[PDB]
RNA sequence: GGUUUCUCUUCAGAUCGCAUAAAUCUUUCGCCUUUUACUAAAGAUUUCCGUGGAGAGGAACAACCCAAUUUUUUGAGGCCUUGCAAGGCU
């Protein structure tokens, strides 16, 4: 045997199944940095005048 | 009692081998009509060219000097009192 067609195999390959068909994605970062600047109103998301 | 040299069995931990091949399978890659033959990395399992320890049998070559301080060549023996022991003695 020679592994001649390894991307196109008779089944779904392991990497292909992970990336497209419901394998576990690594999912590393989640909302790493989402902080409003201190000078901004939380409701308006714009610089406050009367804090 | 020894050494050398062949065959077989068994166990291999040691860089088993200051050397280094191939095959099979699974992952990823490169080739791109299909299959041989392949490109190159990881992991797993075998084969092959060699090696070490132990045991058994065969054959060949050799042989049944301190006595003078610090130790071991003596300060060694004798008397008195009390309940051999202690002390005083010579």
Coordinates of C-alpha atoms (C1' of nucleotides) in Angstrom, one line a residue:
Chain A
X1 CA 0.0 0.0 0.0
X2 CA 0.9 3.6 -0.8
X3 CA -1.0 6.5 0.7
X4 CA -1.5 8.1 -2.7
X5 CA -4.8 10.0 -2.2
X6 CA -4.9 11.1 1.4
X7 CA -7.0 14.2 1.2
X8 CA -9.6 12.5 -1.1
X9 CA -10.1 9.1 0.6
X10 CA -13.0 6.7 0.6
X11 CA -14.3 8.1 3.8
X12 CA -14.3 11.4 5.6
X13 CA -10.9 12.0 7.0
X14 CA -10.3 13.0 10.6
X15 CA -9.3 16.6 9.9
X16 CA -12.1 17.0 7.4
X17 CA -14.6 15.8 9.9
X18 CA -13.3 18.1 12.6
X19 CA -13.3 21.1 10.4
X20 CA -16.6 20.6 8.7
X21 CA -18.8 17.9 10.1
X22 CA -19.0 18.4 13.8
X23 CA -15.7 17.6 15.3
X24 CA -14.5 19.7 18.3
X25 CA -13.2 23.1 17.3
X26 CA -10.4 24.4 19.6
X27 CA -12.3 27.6 20.2
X28 CA -9.5 29.4 21.9
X29 CA -10.4 33.1 22.5
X30 CA -13.8 34.4 23.8
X31 CA -14.4 38.2 24.2
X32 CA -10.7 38.7 25.3
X33 CA -10.9 42.5 25.5
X34 CA -14.2 44.4 25.5
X35 CA -14.0 47.3 27.9
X36 CA -15.6 50.7 27.3
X37 CA -13.2 53.5 28.0
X38 CA -13.6 55.2 31.3
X39 CA -14.6 58.5 29.9
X40 CA -17.7 57.1 28.2
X41 CA -21.4 56.8 29.3
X42 CA -22.4 53.1 29.5
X43 CA -25.8 53.7 27.9
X44 CA -24.8 56.1 25.1
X45 CA -21.3 54.5 24.5
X46 CA -20.1 58.1 24.0
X47 CA -18.1 60.5 26.1
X48 CA -20.1 61.7 29.1
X49 CA -20.5 65.3 30.2
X50 CA -22.2 64.9 33.6
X51 CA -21.1 61.7 35.3
Chain B
rG1 C1' 42.7 -27.0 37.1
rG2 C1' 43.6 -24.0 31.3
rU3 C1' 43.3 -21.9 26.2
rU4 C1' 41.6 -22.1 21.1
rU5 C1' 37.8 -23.7 17.9
rC6 C1' 32.6 -25.6 15.7
rU7 C1' 27.0 -27.0 16.6
rC8 C1' 22.7 -26.5 19.5
rU9 C1' 19.4 -24.4 23.5
rU10 C1' 17.9 -20.3 26.5
rC11 C1' 17.8 -15.1 28.4
rA12 C1' 18.6 -10.1 26.4
rG13 C1' 18.3 -5.4 30.3
rA14 C1' 23.4 -2.3 27.6
rU15 C1' 25.0 3.6 22.3
rC16 C1' 22.2 -4.7 22.7
rG17 C1' 25.3 -2.2 16.7
rC18 C1' 30.5 5.0 18.6
rA19 C1' 26.8 1.5 12.6
rU20 C1' 22.3 1.7 9.9
rA21 C1' 18.4 -0.9 5.7
rA22 C1' 13.3 -2.6 3.9
rA23 C1' 8.1 -3.8 4.5
rU24 C1' 2.9 -3.2 6.6
rC25 C1' -0.9 0.0 9.0
rU26 C1' -2.9 4.9 10.8
rU27 C1' -2.5 10.3 10.7
rU28 C1' -1.2 14.6 8.3
rC29 C1' 1.6 16.6 3.3
rG30 C1' 3.7 16.8 -2.2
rC31 C1' 2.7 14.8 -6.9
rC32 C1' -2.9 14.8 -10.1
rU33 C1' -7.0 10.8 -15.3
rU34 C1' -6.6 5.3 -12.8
rU35 C1' -3.0 1.6 -10.7
rU36 C1' 2.2 0.1 -10.0
rA37 C1' 6.5 3.0 -8.6
rC38 C1' 6.3 7.4 -5.5
rU39 C1' 7.4 12.9 -2.4
rA40 C1' 8.3 13.8 3.7
rA41 C1' 7.1 14.2 8.6
rA42 C1' 4.8 11.8 13.2
rG43 C1' 3.2 7.2 15.6
rA44 C1' 2.5 1.9 15.8
rU45 C1' 4.0 -3.1 14.4
rU46 C1' 7.3 -6.6 11.7
rU47 C1' 11.4 -8.5 8.6
rC48 C1' 16.5 -8.4 7.5
rC49 C1' 22.2 -7.6 7.8
rG50 C1' 25.1 -7.9 13.0
rU51 C1' 26.0 -8.2 18.6
rG52 C1' 26.1 -9.6 24.3
rG53 C1' 25.3 -13.0 29.0
rA54 C1' 24.5 -18.2 30.5
rG55 C1' 24.3 -23.6 29.7
rA56 C1' 25.3 -28.6 27.0
rG57 C1' 28.2 -31.7 23.4
rG58 C1' 32.4 -32.5 19.8
rA59 C1' 37.5 -31.4 18.1
rA60 C1' 42.7 -29.3 18.7
rC61 C1' 47.0 -27.3 21.6
rA62 C1' 49.8 -26.7 26.9
rA63 C1' 50.0 -29.4 31.8
rC64 C1' 48.9 -33.3 36.7
rC65 C1' 64.7 -9.8 63.7
rC66 C1' 61.8 -6.8 70.7
rA67 C1' 65.4 -7.4 78.9
rA68 C1' 67.3 -0.6 80.5
rU69 C1' 60.8 4.6 81.2
rU70 C1' 55.1 4.3 77.4
rU71 C1' 52.8 -2.0 77.9
rU72 C1' 55.5 -8.7 77.5
rU73 C1' 61.5 -10.1 81.2
rU74 C1' 58.9 -6.3 87.6
rG75 C1' 59.5 -2.2 93.0
rA76 C1' 59.1 -7.7 93.0
rG77 C1' 58.2 -9.0 98.8
rG78 C1' 57.5 -8.4 104.7
rC79 C1' 54.7 -5.6 109.8
rC80 C1' 50.0 -3.1 112.6
rU81 C1' 44.1 -2.3 113.7
rU82 C1' 39.0 -3.1 113.1
rG83 C1' 34.2 -5.6 110.4
rC84 C1' 39.0 -11.5 103.0
rA85 C1' 37.8 -5.7 102.7
rA86 C1' 39.7 -0.6 104.1
rG87 C1' 43.7 2.2 106.0
rG88 C1' 48.5 3.1 108.2
rC89 C1' 53.1 1.3 107.3
rU90 C1' 58.7 -1.1 106.1

